Amino acid sequence: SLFPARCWPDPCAGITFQNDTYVCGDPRLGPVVLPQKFPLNNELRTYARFGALCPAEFLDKWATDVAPNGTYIYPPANGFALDTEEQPILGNATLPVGMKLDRFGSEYGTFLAPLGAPYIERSLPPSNLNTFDGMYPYNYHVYQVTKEFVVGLGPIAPWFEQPGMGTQFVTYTNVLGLIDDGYLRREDP
Amino acid sequence: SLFPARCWPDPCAGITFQNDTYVCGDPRLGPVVLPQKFPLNNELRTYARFGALCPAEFLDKWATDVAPNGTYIYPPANGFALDTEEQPILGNATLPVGMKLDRFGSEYGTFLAPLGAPYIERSLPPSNLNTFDGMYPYNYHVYQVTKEFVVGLGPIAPWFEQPGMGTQFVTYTNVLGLIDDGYLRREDP
Ligand SMILES: *[C@@H]1O[C@H](CO[C@@H]2O[C@@H](C)[C@@H](O)[C@@H](O)[C@@H]2O)[C@@H](O[C@@H]2O[C@H](CO)[C@@H](O[C@@H]3O[C@H](CO)[C@@H](O)[C@H](O[C@H]4O[C@H](CO)[C@@H](O)[C@H](O)[C@@H]4O)[C@@H]3O)[C@H](O)[C@H]2NC(C)=O)[C@H](O)[C@H]1NC(C)=O
Ligand SMILES: *[C@@H]1O[C@H](CO[C@@H]2O[C@@H](C)[C@@H](O)[C@@H](O)[C@@H]2O)[C@@H](O[C@@H]2O[C@H](CO)[C@@H](O)[C@H](O)[C@H]2NC(C)=O)[C@H](O)[C@H]1NC(C)=O
Ligand SMILES: *[C@@H]1O[C@H](CO)[C@@H](O)[C@H](O)[C@H]1NC(C)=O
Ligand SMILES: *[C@@H]1O[C@H](CO)[C@@H](O)[C@H](O)[C@H]1NC(C)=O
Ligand SMILES: *[C@@H]1O[C@H](CO)[C@@H](O)[C@H](O)[C@H]1NC(C)=O
Ligand SMILES: *[C@@H]1O[C@H](CO)[C@@H](O)[C@H](O)[C@H]1NC(C)=O
């Protein structure tokens, strides 16, 4: 189920091989071995890393180049779902003390999600699944709100062949600042 | 496990026993045997049916009465997350052909969700988990968008001791009329 069935016998057609840790040797396509602590699946919805596309089709559509120097293109309006007038749907909301948040990316960032939200809801590309220890994604962090503060709160638009429709929180201070001023604390999962 | 530890040695204290298929014999508290196909946990969080409350405390807080005639109290503003001005966060959005949706409730209803969203994201009470085939919840329906239509789309507020923060779709005609007119089609899960 790694690749759509149509992509056989040669699913890696068009992909330049860099390092055999990664699918078709390309880190953008995520790891062969997936981090054993994100399950991603249930009986109703499964994680199709490329959607119904084959790997090279997926890179051509969602990156600037299928070649290794291509980079992923991200959605407009900070990835918020768009209303019928093409405006992102969100509002300023207060996060309460005790709430559990997680994040893919460095603490220089400003985007969090609720702890544990399934991957396919986040519309993140495959390379966010790369790991260093097999347990967890290499850029995955978990936090707890320690003092109430206001964020932009709203639904996640579909992208990268994923359905999206989780909720995301866009902070007005980066995570490092929020930790330093006592709004968030780090938790190790 | 099923009940918080402090609730022992008599966790069903205060619950009137009706039928031994249900926890403490109360259908409002959901099935002893949970439907073996349905996604409760999200990725890293497990499903606590009562949160940290004991059963009788849970019904006192979330229902009109602990007695068997008590009915669940639902959140204001259709259960949308509220902004800092106490207004629901949402906008009108066009659902696209091909989108997969599901719903807990009769087709006389107006609320739908992305197919497969984890139960803990929906802020629904435990009795929506009651199952007669043991496989799927009794009131559970799956649909696919066959023609575009506009819904109210937004995040789900925490309620019933659950974290919420899935996305919900509120239709302007009940689900039945969307099916009859070719906007949705029924699917067997
Ligand atoms: C998102 O969309 C909903 C629903 O709008 C309906 O569905 C859409 C898919 C689309 O087809 C729309 O064309 C369609 O209206 C919006 O909710 C509705 O908002 C209207 C007004 O904006 C409400 O109508 C009001 O109803 C009142 C009684 O319940 C009544 O007092 C009002 O009458 C007055 O106003 C009219 C002019 O608007 C005037 O002619 C009258 O004589 C009188 O002065 C008014 O009719 C609906 O009740 C709302 N429907 C629901 C289900 O709530 C929603 O505003 C929109 N949201 C965003 C953010 O765009
Ligand atoms: C949500 O807030 C942002 C940012 O405003 C800051 O945070 C809020 C919680 C509130 O306390 C504000 O007073 C703070 O300044 C709003 O974006 C701002 O919009 C104004 C309007 O032109 C603009 O001058 C600022 O530069 C914007 N700031 C940023 C960081 O973009 C946003 O409009 C608010 N959304 C609402 C109220 O729905
Ligand atoms: C890249 O490939 C080399 C094999 O020469 C391997 O040692 C290394 O671990 C790979 N990089 C990873 C897994 O990040
Ligand atoms: C990326 O590499 C390909 C060659 O493999 C080249 O065609 C393309 O122009 C490159 N883009 C750059 C260097 O920005
Ligand atoms: C309880 O309810 C189920 C279905 O609602 C029914 O099959 C059963 O006979 C009822 N009574 C008992 C004692 O189980
Ligand atoms: C439910 O019935 C009980 C009798 O067992 C009664 O005390 C109570 O008033 C009823 N519920 C409400 C909300 O009135």
Residue numbers in the entry:
A (entry chain A), B (entry chain B): 27 to 215
Provide passages from the article that reported this PDB entry:
These toxins invade cells and act as NAD glycohydrolases, cleaving NAD+ into Nam and ADPR and rapidly depleting the cellular NAD pool, ultimately leading to cell death. In this context, we recently discovered a new fungal NADase on the surface of conidia from Aspergillus fumigatus (AfNADase), the predominant etiologic agent of Aspergillosis. The catalytic part of the TNT is structurally highly similar to AfNADase. Intriguingly, the active site architecture of the bacterial and fungal enzymes is conserved, but their structural superimposition reveals the presence of a unique C-terminal calcium-binding motif in AfNADase, which is located at the edge of the dimerization interface. In the present study, we addressed the structural and functional role of calcium binding by introducing mutations in the C-terminus of AfNADase that precluded the binding of the metal ion.
In the second variant, we created a chimeric NADase by replacing the 10 C-terminal amino acids, including the Ca2+-binding motif, with the C-terminus from N. crassa NADase (NcNADase). Importantly, NcNADase lacks the calcium binding site and as a result the chimeric protein, here referred to as AfNADase NcC-Term, is predicted to be unable to bind calcium. Compared to the wild-type enzyme, AfNADase NcC-Term showed a 5-fold decrease in affinity and a 66-fold reduced conversion rate (KM of 272.8 ± 48.6 μM and a Vmax of 69.8 ± 5.3 μmol/min/mg). In contrast, AfNADase NcC-Term showed a large shift in TM, from 71.4 to 57.9 °C for the wild-type and NcC-Term, respectively. These data suggest that at least in the AfNADase NcC-Term, the overall stability of the protein is affected by the modification of the C-terminus that eliminates the calcium binding site. The structure was chosen for the analysis based on the hypothesis that it represents a static conformation resembling dimer 2 of AfNADaseD219A/E220A. In line with this suggestion, the AfNADase NcC-Term variant (dimer 2-like), which lacks the ability to form the native-like C-terminal conformation, exhibits substantially decreased catalytic activity and thermostability.
